[PDB]
Each structure stands twice: as C-alpha cells, then as structure tokens.
TrEMBL record:
Domain Beta-lactamase-related: 11-362
Keyword set, alphabetical order: Antibiotic resistance, Hydrolase, Signal
GO molecular function annotation: beta-lactamase activity
Membrane-spanning segments: none
Domain of life per record: Bacteria
Enzyme class: hydrolase
Name under which the protein is recorded: Beta-lactamase
A GO CC term attached to the entry: outer membrane-bounded periplasmic space
Entries under Gene3D superfamilies matching the protein: DD-peptidase/beta-lactamase superfamily
PANTHER family in alphabetical order: BETA-LACTAMASE-RELATED (PTHR46825:SF8), D-ALANYL-D-ALANINE-CARBOXYPEPTIDASE/ENDOPEPTIDASE AMPH (PTHR46825)
Length: 363
C-alpha cells in the first residue's frame, strides 16, 4: 500500500540517475497504480528551444508500434475477416512462389515464417518491388520452427490483415483502435497543428526525427506511431484490463494479442506483445533484452492451441528509432504498469532494469 508520495519518490530516484548516466535529454513516465495513471515528466523535449517535457509531448514509439498492429490484427480476427490459421497466400494471391506453402498468417505475425529478414530492403520502393522481394525470398528454416524478430514479417502481417476491411493500415488503425479507445493524440502522421508538441530526438548530440519510407502497403507502419504519455498510459490500461473496453471485437483483439502462441526459452510470443510468467527475476528480463539474444534466430515450442492471456504475466515491449527510446511493461495480476518515453535511444537493458525497479516497489 505505497502512497502516491512514496511512488513519486521511487520514480524520481530511479529516473533521475538514469537520465544522467545515459545522457537522456527528457523523459515522460506514467505509472498505472490503483486504477489510474500517475504522471512524471523530466527534462527537455527540445534542447535548443529550451522546451520542457510535458504530458502533451509527442515521442516516437518505434517498435512498440507493433503492439498496436497486433491488437488491430486481433480485432480483424474477432470480426471474422481473417484467421491466424489461413495461409498468407489467401490474402495475397499474387504471391505464387511455392516456398510460401505452409506459411500462415500466424507465422508472419509472430516471426516464425522461416527467416524473413529484420528489415525490408531499401531497394523495395513500391508494391511491385515488394512482391518481388517476397517472391525471391528463400527461407532458411521450415515454418513454425524458428523465431527471428523481423519487421519484414509482422509488417506484412499488418498490411494483409487490414485488406478485408478495405481500409489502408493508417485508416483501419484510427477507426478501429485509436478512436474507440479515445487515443486522440496518437498519430502515424503528426498533423501540422500538433507539431508544436512533437519532441526532437537526439543521437550523438544531433537533433533528429523519424523519416517517411517509400509509398507502399507498409509505409504507414514503417513510419511508426507517435503519441504522448497520457494516451500511452491509457493504451496500457486498455491492454491491462480489456474487460473495461466496450467494443466486443476490440476487447477480443486485445486478448488475442496477449495470448501465448510460442515459447522461446523463458519468454512467450504474442501478437506484438511479449510475455514472461510472473513472478520473474530482474536478471531474466534484463538479460533477455540484450540485442545478442533479442535479434538471434531461436527455436520455438508451439503452444497449440494458443494459450489465452495469463494474468500472472510480465507483459512488455521495447522500441526505439534513431533519436528515441521507449519501454512499456505491466502485470495484469497486480494491475500495475509503467510507460517510459525518452528522446534518446539508450540501452534496452537499462530501460528494463529501471522499469522493474519501480514496479517491484508496487508489488
Ligand atoms: C523497433 O524499435 C525496431 C525495428 C527495427 C528494425 C531494424 C533495426 C532496428 N529495430 C528496431 N529498434 C531497435 C534498436 O534500434 O535499438 C531494436 C534493438 C534490438 C535490441 N533488443 O537491442 C529492436 S526493438 O527493441 O524491437
Ligand atoms: Na537486398
């Protein structure tokens, strides 16, 4: 029964040393505790302009954008528009290469298609060349046997998952996920009227921001999600407690995103989200966040059928861009969670260590 006064100290005593040690210009933190969000802001959103971080400052989520993709995909499944058991070719009949037989939407969504690479090559500058890329790809492993984190994998899942709806990814996300949850300050493309809240990212001392990719069915997702700490806190709350979400299919989509589809060592792969059974030790989580392991191709143990959301889980996702570093984690059983948005990409292990320390105090 930690008081708000104590929580404020715990956060300050953890984030302050962190920002100084990692040279973080600014950070927006939100802790979900006792049914509501608690906000703490530190530093600058724009160093040269001397603008401070506020609850309205927009940060780049990077790969945490994948959690929105997973939920949007879950929603489409709950609507009957797609099934994770359908072959990828059902949604893209032009993908005729036989190496695709046996590869399911589930494999694309969870990085198990057989070695799709981390990124889609820069040579891919339109849809005709994207098809060429997937047609030419030769898997290094059979489907459902190896997990290799890849934007070329989940990115395609996202583009194909919204096809039945008839809407482009950005529009489908806004209409079916953001608007319903009242995340009205979360964007792919920041409107010029909101640009004043857009923080600058920093890399080796230079102010930087994300750039757009070549027009295609993956361009919106590639551009990624931008949002403030309030919307992000509410995103965590909706995923933490889908029972409070009214829309029937979105509620189910949220559940599908936290379901366990594969076990890799001590972690479980969901749709976007990743999970570990709770209780879990800090070194298990921190050590798993190292790029050496996070990007390696590892063997998977199938969870068939998928295990529905386990309340006693540590649910999280890290994400970065050239100038931003973010992390989100929550434990449904305890109804506690945390969001940490920063405008500099610092080591993922430091993010995990800090988040764990703060939540450990609330447990
Ligand atoms: C997501 O944030 C993302 C997408 C890609 C594709 C290619 C290169 C970079 N990654 C990122 N971000 C990073 C990063 O630049 O630090 C990641 C690093 C890996 C790690 N665990 O250290 C992957 S992110 O955490 O999902
Ligand atoms: Na290439």
């Amino acid at each position: 029964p930690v008081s708000e006064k104590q929580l404020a100290e715990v956060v300050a005593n953890t984030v302050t040393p962190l920002m100084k040690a990692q040279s973080v210009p600014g950070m927006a933190v939100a802790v979900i505790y006792q049914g509501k969000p608690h906000y703490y802001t530190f530093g600058k959103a724009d160093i040269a302009a001397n603008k401070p971080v506020t609850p309205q400052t927009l940060f780049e989520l990077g790969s945490i954008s994948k959690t929105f993709t997973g939920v949007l995909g879950g929603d489409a499944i709950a609507r009957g528009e797609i099934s994770l058991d359908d072959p990828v070719t059902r949604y893209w009949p032009q993908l005729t290469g036989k190496q695709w037989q046996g590869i399911r939407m589930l494999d694309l969504a969870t990085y198990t298609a057989g070695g799709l690479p981390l990124q889609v090559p820069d040579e891919v500058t339109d849809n005709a060349s994207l098809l060429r890329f997937y047609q030419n790809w030769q898997p290094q492993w059979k489907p459902g046997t190896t997990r290799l984190y890849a934007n070329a994998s989940i990115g395609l899942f996202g583009a194909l998952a919204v096809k039945p709806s008839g809407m482009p990814y950005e529009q489908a996300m806004t209409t079916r996920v953001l608007k319903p949850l009242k995340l009205d300050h979360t964007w792919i493309n920041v409107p010029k009227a909101e640009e004043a809240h857009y923080a600058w990212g920093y890399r080796d001392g230079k102010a930087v921001r994300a750039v757009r990719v070549s027009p295609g069915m993956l361009d919106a997702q590639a551009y990624g999600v931008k949002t403030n700490v309030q919307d992000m806190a509410n995103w965590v709350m909706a995923n933490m407690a889908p029972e409070n979400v009214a829309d029937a299919s979105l509620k189910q989509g949220i559940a599908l995103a936290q379901s366990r589809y594969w076990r890799i060592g001590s972690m479980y792969q969901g749709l976007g989200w990743e999970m570990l059974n709770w209780p879990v030790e800090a070194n298990t989580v921190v050590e798993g966040s190292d790029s050496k392991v996070a990007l390696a191709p590892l063997p998977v143990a199938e969870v068939n059928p998928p295990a529905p959301p386990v309340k006693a889980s540590w649910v999280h996702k890290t994400g970065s861009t050239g100038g931003f570093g973010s992390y989100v984690a929550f434990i449904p059983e305890k109804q506690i969670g945390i969001v940490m948005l920063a405008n500099t990409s610092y080591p993922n292990p430091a993010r995990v260590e800090a988040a764990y320390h703060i939540l450990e105090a609330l447990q």
